[PDB]
Design an enzyme around this catalytic site. Structure first.
Site, PDB file in Angstrom:
ATOM      1  N   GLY A  17       0.798  -1.214   0.000  1.00 40.32           N
ATOM      2  CA  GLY A  17       0.000   0.000   0.000  1.00 40.32           C
ATOM      3  C   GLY A  17       0.833   1.268   0.000  1.00 40.32           C
ATOM      4  N   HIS A  18       0.191   2.388   0.317  1.00 42.08           N
ATOM      5  CA  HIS A  18       0.861   3.682   0.373  1.00 42.08           C
ATOM      6  C   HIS A  18       0.384   4.481   1.580  1.00 42.08           C
ATOM      7  CE1 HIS A  18       0.848   2.296  -3.804  1.00 42.08           C
ATOM      8  NE2 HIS A  18       1.969   2.973  -3.976  1.00 42.08           N
ATOM      9  N   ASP A 118      -6.021   9.641  15.101  1.00 44.09           N
ATOM     10  CA  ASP A 118      -6.476   9.179  13.794  1.00 44.09           C
ATOM     11  C   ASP A 118      -6.747   7.676  13.792  1.00 44.09           C
ATOM     12  OD1 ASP A 118      -7.176   9.325  11.091  1.00 44.09           O
ATOM     13  OD2 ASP A 118      -5.106   8.999  10.427  1.00 44.09           O
ATOM     14  N   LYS A 120      -8.826   4.514  12.869  1.00 49.95           N
ATOM     15  CA  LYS A 120      -9.802   4.070  11.877  1.00 49.95           C
ATOM     16  C   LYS A 120      -9.421   2.683  11.357  1.00 49.95           C
ATOM     17  CE  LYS A 120      -7.416   6.893   8.402  1.00 49.95           C
ATOM     18  NZ  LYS A 120      -7.589   7.952   7.373  1.00 49.95           N
ATOM     19  N   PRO A 121     -10.384   1.965  10.748  1.00 47.51           N
ATOM     20  CA  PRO A 121     -10.166   0.575  10.323  1.00 47.51           C
ATOM     21  C   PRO A 121      -8.912   0.361   9.478  1.00 47.51           C
ATOM     22  CG  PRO A 121     -12.470   1.109  10.135  1.00 47.51           C
ATOM     23  CD  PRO A 121     -11.774   2.390  10.504  1.00 47.51           C
TER      24      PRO A 121
HETATM   25  C1  LIG Z   1       3.663   6.128  15.200  1.00 50.19           C
HETATM   26  C2  LIG Z   1       3.525   5.043  14.214  1.00 50.19           C
HETATM   27  C3  LIG Z   1       3.417   4.181  13.426  1.00 50.19           C
HETATM   28  C4  LIG Z   1       3.286   3.129  12.465  1.00 50.19           C
HETATM   29  O1  LIG Z   1       2.695   2.105  12.757  1.00 50.19           O
HETATM   30  N1  LIG Z   1       3.817   3.284  11.236  1.00 50.19           N
HETATM   31  C5  LIG Z   1       3.725   2.276  10.275  1.00 50.19           C
HETATM   32  C6  LIG Z   1       4.899   1.711   9.823  1.00 50.19           C
HETATM   33  C7  LIG Z   1       4.896   0.698   8.874  1.00 50.19           C
HETATM   34  C8  LIG Z   1       3.723   0.231   8.367  1.00 50.19           C
HETATM   35  C9  LIG Z   1       2.500   0.771   8.802  1.00 50.19           C
HETATM   36  C10 LIG Z   1       1.288   0.286   8.275  1.00 50.19           C
HETATM   37  O2  LIG Z   1       1.376  -0.716   7.361  1.00 50.19           O
HETATM   38  C11 LIG Z   1       0.688  -0.742   6.195  1.00 50.19           C
HETATM   39  N2  LIG Z   1       0.390   0.403   5.600  1.00 50.19           N
HETATM   40  C12 LIG Z   1      -0.279   0.449   4.466  1.00 50.19           C
HETATM   41  C13 LIG Z   1      -0.700  -0.710   3.845  1.00 50.19           C
HETATM   42  C14 LIG Z   1      -0.416  -1.936   4.424  1.00 50.19           C
HETATM   43  C15 LIG Z   1       0.292  -1.971   5.628  1.00 50.19           C
HETATM   44  C16 LIG Z   1       0.595  -3.295   6.246  1.00 50.19           C
HETATM   45  C17 LIG Z   1       1.371  -3.425   7.404  1.00 50.19           C
HETATM   46  C18 LIG Z   1       1.615  -4.680   7.924  1.00 50.19           C
HETATM   47  N3  LIG Z   1       1.109  -5.734   7.309  1.00 50.19           N
HETATM   48  C19 LIG Z   1       0.376  -5.599   6.215  1.00 50.19           C
HETATM   49  N4  LIG Z   1      -0.128  -6.744   5.621  1.00 50.19           N
HETATM   50  C20 LIG Z   1      -0.934  -6.672   4.402  1.00 50.19           C
HETATM   51  C21 LIG Z   1      -0.959  -8.051   3.737  1.00 50.19           C
HETATM   52  C22 LIG Z   1      -1.867  -7.999   2.507  1.00 50.19           C
HETATM   53  C23 LIG Z   1      -3.266  -7.553   2.941  1.00 50.19           C
HETATM   54  N5  LIG Z   1      -3.183  -6.217   3.542  1.00 50.19           N
HETATM   55  C24 LIG Z   1      -2.360  -6.245   4.757  1.00 50.19           C
HETATM   56  N6  LIG Z   1       0.120  -4.409   5.688  1.00 50.19           N
HETATM   57  C25 LIG Z   1       0.101   0.821   8.716  1.00 50.19           C
HETATM   58  C26 LIG Z   1      -1.235   0.341   8.201  1.00 50.19           C
HETATM   59  C27 LIG Z   1       0.100   1.837   9.665  1.00 50.19           C
HETATM   60  C28 LIG Z   1       1.258   2.326  10.184  1.00 50.19           C
HETATM   61  C29 LIG Z   1       2.491   1.803   9.768  1.00 50.19           C
END
Ligand SMILES: CC#CC(=O)Nc1cccc2c(Oc3ncccc3-c3ccnc(N[C@H]4CCCNC4)n3)c(C)ccc12
Ligand SMILES: CC#CC(=O)Nc1cccc2c(Oc3ncccc3-c3ccnc(N[C@H]4CCCNC4)n3)c(C)ccc12
EC number: 2.7.11.1
Lengths: 363, 371
Positions: A17-18, A118, A120-121
């Site tokens: 993701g982003h 912030d 949220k799901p």
């Molecule tokens: C203060 C502070 C802080 C803090 O936490 N900073 C973060 C660092 C690194 C990753 C993060 C993060 O990570 C993602 N951000 C965007 C998209 C996906 C993921 C993510 C992270 C871990 N695992 C997965 N697994 C996927 C497998 C395929 C299905 N979708 C889930 N995705 C989220 C959300 C939120 C915060 C993140």
């Protein structure tokens, strides 16, 4: 190909993701991890992000941070790789438990004087199963194009009550399996400012819903002073097990046994009791009818105690219409969906008494 | 001045323990302890780290952060703790308001976790059990370490000296640790260098646990089973956790009620009271009505069944009782149950193993371990 920035490694082919950033599936110390790659224009912001992770990731319901790695170009942050975000979980195992876990994690951040600002799901992550098949929710992205989950006070130095509002929406989001108290996606934030909320998916006749909305309505209050703290939320009947519910109906039936009808307890307990008992709770039972008033809430609570305390020495015909733990209390809650919600709010007069301290909240 | 190996860094001046050497270091700006394994053990370290990774997700198992290879030696970084369990019992550290039962509860929880991952500790002892730094809430906890690998002994089960072991091995070790924590230094099998030889023999002693103190009667009952010379008689980790040794004062009281209620409609000639009365005279001190304080005596003194009922209705009808009697019994639920266990230190231990017939009834399943 695979990129390497020290102990962290990842293949740019696998993106998860982003801001102008990207998040890849990678590795760290031969662990599966999600690596967030950020530009040089956010290093001052990331060092603050990593700082929060190092301090708060020592709780099972807060995302586990592993390591960060600066490079000649971009900086990297390694987080535990999860199965799905809460958004994906719904928009594509047990709901009350995820919210309990989520709220627990949130309560943890608040106890460290950290506001999520912030919730949220998208920020709530669902772990992979852990060799015992257990999945859990984990908070992330805390203490740092549309909205929809922002408290109305934030249109900076927010208090904890902000996250509670956000959670209240998440609560309704998981139960409704997609809906939001303030409408469809693009509609939410505007309706929040206008205080236009709706809990339509929670019916007034369903017991589980009467409990839930009693909690959520308070959580999404427009006046922050009326919202309960995270620790407060966790004690709400919404999270109680059926054994605890029944045990709550038993302990209350003991306190009332020596109480007179002139007391302030029975006064509040019978206040609007006629609706709780369905006019006459005797007309909403057949085998259990053989008891040997029918408009008194108290008598209904006295009934279930007796039939529970004597459940062993009871007829098989009565035991049939009534199992022992869960199915027993479900006999009453299902037929009288306002019983627990009413009994709970009325008995708050005893919230300071030791016998009810585990049921109510106050430091 | 400061040896930096990749992400791990440490000042060699700060030696925490001793041919591996353990330094106080840093990783990702986290305080950590750094174990420097030599080239002659790179094969063992890869096994050590492997276990630390798969067995990391538990609050009572030591948290593992990172490893960094180097031409001189390998490095392993774990959570920096305040002390080992040994150091706590030995000397200074004897403070911090540490609950002994809570440590043993936490230790056993971590062990149960390792076992559920089909891992045997093979060497559980106070040196391995680390005591965490206090968190933001001033709470500390015990964490297991050095588990699953293949200087004296003394904490080793007698079967491992006479190829791989079973979960019951760690139970023997734990049983000794239980005594070590409670006795604040003693050991069921004697002095340090004396222990392991006494273990091969039948030379064990728990004389620090008197039959007078109600806690000691519970501790003894559990530990004796845990340190049994016959492995097949030792409880599992999860079984130990269910024992009355860990019950709160509230749960101890809640137990006597569910028992009393269960025997309420029971005949005194049944198999469930005769068991309760089996050696009952000693539990009630000949006549319990005499061991009671002056006030409460006002409200069959040789029947345990009646004693449970007496405590039951005394609780059930506590709200409606004299202020003088309410002073004798004490505040519920803590002081009220301690009022009786103090005077009948074999009641709980007796009633528990007696009511073990209903170990499948759901009203008692929370009190007993079962498949
Ligand atoms: C203060 C502070 C802080 C803090 O936490 N900073 C973060 C660092 C690194 C990753 C993060 C993060 O990570 C993602 N951000 C965007 C998209 C996906 C993921 C993510 C992270 C871990 N695992 C997965 N697994 C996927 C497998 C395929 C299905 N979708 C889930 N995705 C989220 C959300 C939120 C915060 C993140
Ligand atoms: C499978 C597998 C495994 C596994 O776990 N392999 C280990 C790696 C690194 C350190 C370990 C370790 O670590 C120490 N080994 C010896 C002496 C001290 C410490 C240590 C560790 C963390 N913190 C502290 N803090 C000091 C502060 C001053 C008072 N004394 C304690 N000491 C212990 C025991 C046990 C195992 C360790």
């Amino acid at each position: 190909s695979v990129v390497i920035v020290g102990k962290i490694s990842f293949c740019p082919k696998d993106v998860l993701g982003h801001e102008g950033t990207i998040v890849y599936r990678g590795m760290f110390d031969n662990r599966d991890v999600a690596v967030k790659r950020i530009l040089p224009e956010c290093f001052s912001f990331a060092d603050r992000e990593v700082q929060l992770l190092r301090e708060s990731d020592e709780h099972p319901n807060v995302i586990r941070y592993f390591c960060t790695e600066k490079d000649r170009q971009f900086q990297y942050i390694a987080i535990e790789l999860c199965a799905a975000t809460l958004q994906e979980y719904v928009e594509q195992l047990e709901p009350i438990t995820l919210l309990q876990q989520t709220t627990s994690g949130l309560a943890h951040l608040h106890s460290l004087n950290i506001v999520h600002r912030d919730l949220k799901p998208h920020n709530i992550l669902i772990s992979m199963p852990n060799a015992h098949g257990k999945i859990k929710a984990m908070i992330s992205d805390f203490g740092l194009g549309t909205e929809g989950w922002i408290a109305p006070e934030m249109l900076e130095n927010p208090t904890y009550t902000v996250d509670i509002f956000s959670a209240g929406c998440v609560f309704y989001y998981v139960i409704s399996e997609g809906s939001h108290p303030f409408g469809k996606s693009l509609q939410r934030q505007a309706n929040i400012l206008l205080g236009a909320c709706s809990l339509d998916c929670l019916h007034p006749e369903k017991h589980e819903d009467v409990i839930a909305r009693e909690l959520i309505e308070k959580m999404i209050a427009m006046d922050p002073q009326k919202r309960p703290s995270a620790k407060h939320v966790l004690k709400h009947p919404f999270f109680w097990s059926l054994e605890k519910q029944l045990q709550f109906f038993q302990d209350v039936s003991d306190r009332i046994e020596k109480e007179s009808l002139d007391g302030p307890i029975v006064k509040q307990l019978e206040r609007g009791g006629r609706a709780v008992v369905k006019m006459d709770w005797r007309e909403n039972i057949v085998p259990l009818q053989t008891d040997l008033k029918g408009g008194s809430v108290r008598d209904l609570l006295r009934a279930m105690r007796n039939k529970k305390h004597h459940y062993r020495e009871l007829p098989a015909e009565v035991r049939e219409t009534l199992s022992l733990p869960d199915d027993f209390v479900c006999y009453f809650t299902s037929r009288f969906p306002h019983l627990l919600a009413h009994t709970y709010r009325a008995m708050e007069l005893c919230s300071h008494e030791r016998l009810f301290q585990p049921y109510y909240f106050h430091e």
